[PDB]
Protein backbone atom coordinates (compact mmCIF):
# COMPACT_ATOMS: atom_id res chain seq x y z
CA UNK A 1 0.00 0.00 0.00
CA UNK A 2 3.06 2.22 -0.45
CA UNK A 3 2.55 2.86 -4.17
CA UNK A 4 -1.05 3.75 -3.32
CA UNK A 5 0.09 6.24 -0.68
CA UNK A 6 2.67 7.78 -3.02
CA UNK A 7 0.11 8.11 -5.82
CA UNK A 8 -2.28 9.77 -3.36
CA UNK A 9 0.41 12.23 -2.25
CA UNK A 10 1.04 13.31 -5.85
CA UNK A 11 -2.71 13.63 -6.40
CA UNK A 12 -2.92 16.27 -3.68
CA UNK A 13 0.12 18.26 -4.82
CA UNK A 14 -1.04 18.10 -8.45
CA UNK A 15 -4.36 19.65 -7.44
CA UNK A 16 -3.24 22.26 -4.91
CA UNK A 17 -0.33 23.21 -7.15
CA UNK A 18 -2.09 23.82 -10.46
CA UNK A 19 -5.27 25.06 -8.78
CA UNK A 20 -3.17 27.70 -7.04
CA UNK A 21 -1.79 28.65 -10.46
CA UNK A 22 -5.27 28.96 -11.98
CA UNK A 23 -6.20 31.25 -9.08
CA UNK A 24 -3.23 33.60 -9.40
CA UNK A 25 -4.04 34.05 -13.10
CA UNK A 26 -7.54 35.11 -12.04
CA UNK A 27 -6.58 37.52 -9.26
CA UNK A 28 -3.47 39.19 -10.68
CA UNK A 29 -4.28 40.73 -14.07
CA UNK A 30 -0.55 41.09 -14.72
CA UNK A 31 -0.47 37.38 -15.55
CA UNK A 32 -3.49 37.36 -17.86
CA UNK A 33 -1.42 37.73 -21.02
CA UNK A 34 -1.99 35.59 -24.12
CA UNK A 35 1.04 33.52 -23.11
CA UNK A 36 -0.45 32.33 -19.82
CA UNK A 37 -3.70 31.37 -21.54
CA UNK A 38 -2.00 28.16 -22.63
CA UNK A 39 -0.41 27.79 -19.19
CA UNK A 40 -3.93 27.59 -17.78
CA UNK A 41 -4.68 24.75 -20.21
CA UNK A 42 -1.52 23.06 -18.95
CA UNK A 43 -2.76 23.64 -15.40
CA UNK A 44 -6.30 22.35 -15.95
CA UNK A 45 -4.88 19.32 -17.74
CA UNK A 46 -2.43 18.63 -14.92
CA UNK A 47 -5.27 19.09 -12.43
CA UNK A 48 -7.43 16.35 -13.93
CA UNK A 49 -4.34 14.20 -13.45
CA UNK A 50 -4.64 14.34 -9.67
CA UNK A 51 -8.42 14.31 -10.03
CA UNK A 52 -9.11 11.52 -12.53
CA UNK A 53 -5.94 10.22 -14.21
CA UNK A 54 -4.29 9.09 -10.97
CA UNK A 55 -7.54 7.82 -9.41
CA UNK A 56 -8.00 5.81 -12.62
CA UNK A 57 -4.41 4.56 -12.78
CA UNK A 58 -4.68 3.24 -9.22
CA UNK A 59 -7.93 1.46 -10.08
CA UNK A 60 -6.74 -0.04 -13.37
CA UNK A 61 -3.47 -1.19 -11.79
CA UNK A 62 -5.34 -3.85 -9.82
CA UNK A 63 -7.74 -4.34 -12.73
CA UNK A 64 -11.54 -4.37 -12.65
CA UNK A 65 -14.57 -5.54 -14.63
CA UNK A 66 -16.39 -3.22 -17.04
CA UNK A 67 -17.46 -2.80 -20.66
CA UNK A 68 -14.93 -1.95 -23.38
CA UNK A 69 -16.06 1.68 -23.52
CA UNK A 70 -15.87 2.22 -19.77
CA UNK A 71 -12.59 0.31 -19.56
CA UNK A 72 -10.81 2.10 -22.40
CA UNK A 73 -11.77 5.55 -21.11
CA UNK A 74 -10.28 4.76 -17.70
CA UNK A 75 -7.21 3.43 -19.53
CA UNK A 76 -6.78 6.14 -22.16
CA UNK A 77 -7.86 9.17 -20.14
CA UNK A 78 -4.27 9.82 -19.10
CA UNK A 79 -3.39 9.81 -22.80
CA UNK A 80 -5.66 12.84 -23.14
CA UNK A 81 -4.09 14.93 -20.37
CA UNK A 82 -0.70 13.93 -21.77
CA UNK A 83 -1.56 14.93 -25.34
CA UNK A 84 -3.11 18.25 -24.35
CA UNK A 85 0.01 19.16 -22.37
CA UNK A 86 1.91 18.52 -25.60
CA UNK A 87 -0.04 21.20 -27.48
CA UNK A 88 0.12 23.62 -24.54
CA UNK A 89 3.88 23.15 -24.21
CA UNK A 90 4.25 23.41 -27.99
CA UNK A 91 2.22 26.61 -28.26
CA UNK A 92 4.13 28.19 -25.37
CA UNK A 93 7.30 27.36 -27.30
CA UNK A 94 6.04 28.92 -30.54
CA UNK A 95 4.62 31.88 -28.61
CA UNK A 96 7.90 32.66 -26.84
CA UNK A 97 9.58 32.44 -30.24
CA UNK A 98 7.14 34.88 -31.82
CA UNK A 99 7.84 37.46 -29.11
CA UNK A 100 11.61 37.38 -29.60
CA UNK A 101 11.62 36.83 -33.36
CA UNK A 102 8.85 39.27 -34.31
CA UNK A 103 7.94 41.47 -31.31
CA UNK A 104 5.86 43.84 -33.46
CA UNK A 105 3.55 41.25 -35.03
CA UNK A 106 3.43 39.53 -31.63
CA UNK A 107 0.56 41.66 -30.34
CA UNK A 108 -1.13 41.40 -33.74
CA UNK A 109 -0.94 37.63 -34.16
CA UNK A 110 -0.70 36.33 -30.59
CA UNK A 111 -4.15 37.46 -29.47
CA UNK A 112 -6.19 36.56 -26.40
CA UNK A 113 -8.85 35.33 -28.80
CA UNK A 114 -6.81 33.07 -31.08
CA UNK A 115 -5.25 31.59 -27.94
CA UNK A 116 -8.57 30.41 -26.53
CA UNK A 117 -9.36 29.20 -30.04
CA UNK A 118 -6.26 27.06 -30.50
CA UNK A 119 -6.53 25.64 -26.98
CA UNK A 120 -10.07 24.42 -27.66
CA UNK A 121 -8.92 22.81 -30.91
CA UNK A 122 -5.95 21.25 -29.12
CA UNK A 123 -8.26 19.67 -26.54
CA UNK A 124 -10.59 18.34 -29.23
CA UNK A 125 -7.63 16.78 -31.04
CA UNK A 126 -6.37 15.48 -27.69
CA UNK A 127 -9.56 13.47 -27.19
CA UNK A 128 -9.64 12.24 -30.79
CA UNK A 129 -6.05 11.01 -30.53
CA UNK A 130 -5.90 10.09 -26.84
CA UNK A 131 -9.07 8.04 -27.26
CA UNK A 132 -8.26 6.48 -30.63
CA UNK A 133 -8.14 3.01 -29.04
CA UNK A 134 -11.81 3.60 -28.19
CA UNK A 135 -12.48 4.12 -31.90
CA UNK A 136 -11.34 0.58 -32.73
CA UNK A 137 -7.60 0.34 -32.11
CA UNK A 138 -7.89 -1.98 -29.11
CA UNK A 139 -7.28 -5.54 -27.91
CA UNK A 140 -10.74 -6.19 -26.46
CA UNK A 141 -11.20 -9.96 -26.42
CA UNK A 142 -7.97 -10.86 -28.19
CA UNK A 143 -6.67 -14.44 -27.74
CA UNK A 144 -13.66 -14.19 -14.76
CA UNK A 145 -15.82 -11.13 -15.38
CA UNK A 146 -18.45 -12.75 -17.60
CA UNK A 147 -19.98 -11.79 -20.93
CA UNK A 148 -20.44 -8.05 -21.36
CA UNK A 149 -17.54 -7.24 -19.05
CA UNK A 150 -13.84 -7.36 -19.94
CA UNK A 151 -10.95 -7.80 -17.51
CA UNK A 152 -9.80 -4.18 -17.55
CA UNK A 153 -6.06 -4.84 -17.54
CA UNK A 154 -4.34 -2.11 -19.55
CA UNK A 155 -1.66 -4.17 -21.29
CA UNK A 156 -4.48 -6.50 -22.33
CA UNK A 157 -7.08 -3.88 -23.28
CA UNK A 158 -4.77 -1.37 -24.98
CA UNK A 159 -2.44 -2.31 -27.89
CA UNK A 160 1.32 -1.68 -27.89
CA UNK A 161 1.68 -0.82 -31.57
CA UNK A 162 -0.54 2.17 -30.78
CA UNK A 163 1.36 3.18 -27.65
CA UNK A 164 4.58 3.07 -29.67
CA UNK A 165 4.11 4.07 -33.31
CA UNK A 166 1.02 6.29 -33.11
CA UNK A 167 1.23 7.65 -29.56
CA UNK A 168 4.93 7.84 -28.70
CA UNK A 169 6.78 8.53 -31.96
CA UNK A 170 4.11 10.59 -33.74
CA UNK A 171 2.24 12.29 -30.90
CA UNK A 172 5.13 12.74 -28.46
CA UNK A 173 8.58 12.22 -29.97
CA UNK A 174 7.85 14.35 -33.05
CA UNK A 175 6.37 17.28 -31.09
CA UNK A 176 9.26 17.24 -28.60
CA UNK A 177 11.54 17.35 -31.65
CA UNK A 178 9.70 20.35 -33.07
CA UNK A 179 9.70 22.02 -29.66
CA UNK A 180 13.42 21.44 -29.12
CA UNK A 181 13.89 22.59 -32.71
CA UNK A 182 12.01 25.78 -31.89
CA UNK A 183 14.06 26.63 -28.80
CA UNK A 184 17.09 26.11 -31.05
CA UNK A 185 15.99 29.06 -33.17
CA UNK A 186 14.89 31.12 -30.16
CA UNK A 187 18.17 31.31 -28.25
CA UNK A 188 20.10 31.32 -31.53
CA UNK A 189 18.32 34.48 -32.66
CA UNK A 190 18.06 35.96 -29.17
CA UNK A 191 21.86 36.00 -28.92
CA UNK A 192 21.97 37.58 -32.38
CA UNK A 193 19.64 40.34 -31.19
CA UNK A 194 22.13 41.11 -28.43
CA UNK A 195 24.93 41.18 -31.01
CA UNK A 196 23.08 43.66 -33.22
CA UNK A 197 22.36 45.79 -30.16
CA UNK A 198 26.13 45.66 -29.69
CA UNK A 199 26.82 47.87 -32.71
CA UNK A 200 24.25 50.58 -31.98
CA UNK A 201 25.21 54.29 -31.67
CA UNK A 202 22.82 54.55 -28.71
CA UNK A 203 22.41 52.83 -25.31
CA UNK A 204 18.79 51.71 -25.64
CA UNK A 205 18.83 49.45 -22.59
CA UNK A 206 15.05 49.31 -22.89
CA UNK A 207 15.21 46.96 -25.86
CA UNK A 208 17.90 44.99 -24.02
CA UNK A 209 16.08 44.71 -20.69
CA UNK A 210 12.94 43.71 -22.59
CA UNK A 211 14.90 41.22 -24.68
CA UNK A 212 16.43 39.62 -21.58
CA UNK A 213 12.96 39.41 -20.04
CA UNK A 214 11.60 37.75 -23.17
CA UNK A 215 14.47 35.27 -23.11
CA UNK A 216 14.00 34.73 -19.38
CA UNK A 217 10.44 33.72 -20.24
CA UNK A 218 11.41 31.63 -23.26
CA UNK A 219 13.96 29.80 -21.12
CA UNK A 220 11.48 29.23 -18.31
CA UNK A 221 9.19 27.79 -20.99
CA UNK A 222 12.06 25.57 -22.12
CA UNK A 223 12.50 24.18 -18.61
CA UNK A 224 8.79 23.41 -18.36
CA UNK A 225 8.85 21.61 -21.71
CA UNK A 226 12.12 19.87 -20.88
CA UNK A 227 10.69 18.36 -17.70
CA UNK A 228 7.86 16.82 -19.72
CA UNK A 229 10.11 14.63 -21.88
CA UNK A 230 12.27 13.99 -18.82
CA UNK A 231 9.22 12.55 -17.05
CA UNK A 232 7.61 10.61 -19.91
CA UNK A 233 10.56 9.20 -21.87
CA UNK A 234 11.26 6.55 -19.20
CA UNK A 235 7.72 5.20 -19.57
CA UNK A 236 7.89 5.25 -23.38
CA UNK A 237 11.45 3.92 -23.51
CA UNK A 238 10.23 0.98 -21.44
CA UNK A 239 7.46 0.36 -23.96
CA UNK A 240 9.94 0.51 -26.83
CA UNK A 241 11.97 -2.29 -25.24
CA UNK A 242 8.97 -4.54 -24.67
CA UNK A 243 7.57 -3.98 -28.17
CA UNK A 244 10.53 -3.75 -30.55
CA UNK A 245 12.36 -6.44 -28.57
CA UNK A 246 9.97 -9.21 -27.41
CA UNK A 247 13.09 -11.05 -26.24
CA UNK A 248 14.23 -8.20 -24.00
CA UNK A 249 13.12 -9.14 -20.49
CA UNK A 250 9.74 -7.41 -20.14
CA UNK A 251 10.28 -4.54 -17.70
CA UNK A 252 9.60 -5.55 -14.07
CA UNK A 253 6.52 -4.21 -12.26
CA UNK A 254 8.51 -2.54 -9.49
CA UNK A 255 10.29 -0.57 -12.21
CA UNK A 256 7.17 -0.25 -14.36
CA UNK A 257 5.18 1.77 -11.82
CA UNK A 258 8.20 3.98 -11.16
CA UNK A 259 8.01 5.05 -14.80
CA UNK A 260 4.31 5.60 -14.20
CA UNK A 261 4.73 7.57 -10.97
CA UNK A 262 7.37 9.64 -12.74
CA UNK A 263 4.80 10.53 -15.41
CA UNK A 264 2.27 11.68 -12.80
CA UNK A 265 4.95 13.76 -11.08
CA UNK A 266 5.28 15.93 -14.19
CA UNK A 267 1.92 17.49 -13.33
CA UNK A 268 3.39 18.91 -10.12
CA UNK A 269 6.62 20.48 -11.38
CA UNK A 270 4.80 23.21 -13.31
CA UNK A 271 3.40 25.11 -10.30
CA UNK A 272 6.70 24.99 -8.39
CA UNK A 273 8.64 25.84 -11.55
CA UNK A 274 6.71 29.11 -11.80
CA UNK A 275 7.10 30.17 -8.17
CA UNK A 276 10.84 29.82 -8.74
CA UNK A 277 11.52 31.06 -12.27
CA UNK A 278 8.97 33.88 -12.43
CA UNK A 279 9.36 36.43 -9.64
CA UNK A 280 5.90 37.78 -10.48
CA UNK A 281 4.22 34.49 -9.59
CA UNK A 282 5.90 33.74 -6.25
CA UNK A 283 4.91 37.17 -4.93
CA UNK A 284 1.32 36.62 -6.06
CA UNK A 285 1.10 33.25 -4.29
CA UNK A 286 2.85 34.64 -1.21
CA UNK A 287 -0.02 37.12 -0.92
CA UNK A 288 -2.81 34.59 -1.47
CA UNK A 289 -1.52 32.29 1.27
CA UNK A 290 -1.09 34.97 3.93
CA UNK A 291 -4.47 36.55 3.20
C1 LIG B 1 3.32 4.57 -23.30
C2 LIG B 1 2.80 3.98 -21.98
C3 LIG B 1 1.70 2.91 -22.20
N1 LIG B 1 1.12 2.46 -20.92
C4 LIG B 1 1.75 1.43 -20.28
O1 LIG B 1 2.71 0.78 -20.72
C5 LIG B 1 1.20 1.13 -18.97
N2 LIG B 1 1.62 0.19 -18.04
C6 LIG B 1 0.82 0.30 -16.96
C7 LIG B 1 0.95 -0.50 -15.74
C8 LIG B 1 0.10 -0.25 -14.63
C9 LIG B 1 0.25 -0.99 -13.44
C10 LIG B 1 1.26 -1.97 -13.32
O2 LIG B 1 1.51 -2.71 -12.18
C11 LIG B 1 0.85 -2.32 -10.98
C12 LIG B 1 1.46 -3.09 -9.80
O3 LIG B 1 1.28 -4.30 -9.68
N3 LIG B 1 2.20 -2.38 -8.94
C13 LIG B 1 2.86 -2.92 -7.75
C14 LIG B 1 3.64 -1.80 -7.04
N4 LIG B 1 4.30 -2.32 -5.86
C15 LIG B 1 2.08 -2.24 -14.44
C16 LIG B 1 1.93 -1.51 -15.63
N5 LIG B 1 -0.11 1.27 -17.14
C17 LIG B 1 0.17 1.77 -18.41
N6 LIG B 1 -0.44 2.82 -19.16
C18 LIG B 1 -1.54 3.56 -18.53
C19 LIG B 1 -2.89 2.84 -18.71
C20 LIG B 1 -4.02 3.50 -17.91
C21 LIG B 1 0.03 3.15 -20.41
O4 LIG B 1 -0.52 4.05 -21.06
Swiss-Prot record:
GO cellular component, one term: asymmetric synapse
Ranges that cross the membrane: 2-26, 37-60, 72-94, 115-137, 160-184, 221-244, 253-276
Membrane topology: Multi-pass membrane protein
Species of provenance: Homo sapiens
Main function: Receptor for adenosine. The activity of this receptor is mediated by G proteins which activate adenylyl cyclase.
Family of this protein: Belongs to the G-protein coupled receptor 1 family.
Lineage: Eukaryota, Metazoa, Chordata, Craniata, Vertebrata
Entry keywords, A to Z: Cell membrane, Disulfide bond, G-protein coupled receptor, Glycoprotein, Membrane, Receptor, Transducer, Transmembrane, Transmembrane helix, Ubl conjugation
Stretches assigned to the Cytoplasmic side: 27-36, 95-114, 185-220
Keyword RNA-binding on entry: no
Protein name: Adenosine receptor A2a
Binding site for adenosine: 155, 239, 263-264
Post-translational modifications: Ubiquitinated. Deubiquitinated by USP4; leading to stabilization and expression at the cell surface.
A biological-process GO annotation: positive regulation of apoptotic signaling pathway
Compartmental location: Cell membrane
Subunit organization: Interacts (via cytoplasmic C-terminal domain) with USP4; the interaction is direct. May interact with DRD4. Interacts with NECAB2. Interacts (via cytoplasmic C-terminal domain) with GAS2L2; interaction enhances receptor-mediated adenylyl cyclase activity.
